[PDB]
Each structure stands twice: as structure tokens, then as C-alpha cells.
């Protein structure tokens with residue numbers, strides 16, 4: 074059974090010099106992984122050091138270059154890849170125009186945004202245009218982690234242990250996942266999904282802790298200004314992926330909280346190269362219908378394939 078994978082990364086060497094298997098030129102290594110793991114399509118997004126974290130004209134020009142080079146690559150292998158836009162978030166009106174260009178000119182099927190803006194989370198009024206654009210284009214936004222701000226690193230992650238421990242704790246060990254979950258909650262609480270009810274967002278790492286507390290948020294997080302309960306937005310406007318963390322207890326929690334229709338597959342290639350990607354869905358006690366949904370059908374519907 075073939076899959077569509079949603080959190081698969083690339084970088085461009087020349088863009089990296091300005092800002093190894095992640096390099097877009099490493100085509101054969103990418104295809105070997107996909108073929109061996111029964112992956113039909115990788116949805117490609119910029120990886121480490123994305124130009125989306127830069128400011129002004131430089132951020133604009135480097136995102137345009139990344140998107141153009143990605144589109145040239147997909148045009149060579151159109152049956153195996155779909156593109157997600159890289160946006161200069163620190164320039165929101167320019168980001169919304171680049172989003173439109175990616176969808177309408179480049180044939181991309183959404184955007185992946187790493188971290189947050191230089192001035193905070195994307196619930197701020199100035200970023201509303203990005204979400205409005207995504208709904209208008211009928212495409213999702215994948216909200217991905219990135220390094221936390223220095224004030225969070227110093228308050229929460231530095232402690233009585235080595236610096237390498239503090240850095241990994243702040244990043245992929247825990248911290249940047251806590252951060253992206255909080256960012257996604259800001260988006261819900263700000264009413265983005267009441268303004269743009271057809272908008273869908275995607276989050277990785279089994280929901281960035283959010284599914285652990287859905288029932289508790291409905292009971293304890295006061296949000297009477299929204300049209301729906303807090304949990305409703307995660308069940309109806311979000312999709313969740315594993316990001317190559319192929320662990321059953323988290324899958325079971327996510328299935329009970331959001332349901333099978335909201336789960337998409339993802340490997341986090343090449344930062345994770347999960348050897349069990351092609352067999353994991355067979356170890357969860359799922360029906361063939363459920364396996365088909367997670368592997369390809371939920372994603373094919375979302376991407377309009």
C-alpha cells in the first residue's frame with residue numbers, strides 16, 4: 074500500500090550559504106528511501122535554516138528562489154512530489170503574494186511555516202492576511218517547530234546540567250514541540266477558524282502535545298468569544314502527523330481524540346529515515362479502510378489529488 078508523506082524536507086546549498094541528504098541535489102538517496110518504504114509522494118518543504126526566518130527584501134528574494142528551484146525539481150518528477158510554499162512570514166503582505174504565486178503559478182498545494190515571526194506568534198493582526206490567503210486558495214498551512222526565543226531558552230531550558238542537555242531539551246527533545254503547540258492554540262483562541270472556517274492546518278509530532286489536553290482545555294480554558302469549543306477546532310480544522318515518530322501509544326491517543334479522518338502520514342525525511350515507515354500502519358490493529366485513510370486518502374482529498 075502506497076503513501077503520501079507530509080513532512081519531508083529539502084534545502085538548497087546556495088541558499089544555505091546565504092542564510093547532507095536534505096540537499097535537493099540528493100535525488101537518488103531520496104528515491105531509494107521512498108521506494109523502499111512504499112512512499113508514492115513526498116510533500117516537500119524547506120528544512121533547517123529556512124529563509125522564512127530572515128527579514129525584509131533578503132527573506133522575500135531567498136523564499137522566491139527556494140520555491141522556483143523546488144518547482145523546477147518537481148517538474149522533472151511530477152508523479153513523486155508535491156510542493157509546499159516557503160514564505161517570508163516577517164513580510165506578511167509579501168508572504169501572501171508569494172503564497173498566491175506558489176499555488177497559482179508553481180502548482181504547489183499549501184505552505185509549511187517554521188517557528189514564528191521576529192515579533193511573536195502568528196495570531197497578531199498583521200499576519201491575518203496569510204490565513205485569509207490560504208482559505209481563499211483552499212490549501213492547508215503546516216505549522217512546524219523552530220528554535221525557541223532566547224528568553225524562553227534561558228527561563229525554561231537552561232538548568233543544572235550540561236549545555237548540550239539544555240540545547241537538545243529546548244529543541245527536538247521537548248522545547249520546540251511545546252512551543253509549536255502553544256503557537257497553534259494561539260491561532261485557535263484568536264478566532265482565525267471562525268473568520269476562515271474552511272481553513273485547515275497541519276501539525277506534526279503527534280499534535281505537539283495538544284491531544285494530551287483536549288478534554289482539559291474544554292473544561293478549563295475560558296474561550297466564550299469563539300463559536301465552538303476549543304477541542305472542536307482541533308477535530309475539524311487540524312490534521313495531525315507522526316513526523317517519523319512511529320510509536321503506538323501516541324497513535325492510539327490521537328485516534329481517540331481527533332479520529333482517523335484527521336491523521337496524515339509523514340517521515341521527517343531525511344532528519345529521520347524510519348526503517349519501519351512501510352510496515353508501521355500494519356502494527357496498529359487498524360481496518361484496511363483506516364490504513365488507506367492514513368496512508369493516502371485523507372491526504373489525496375486535502376491536496377485535491
Ligand SMILES: [Ca+2]
Nearest residue numbers: 080217316341
Ligand atoms: Ca521536520
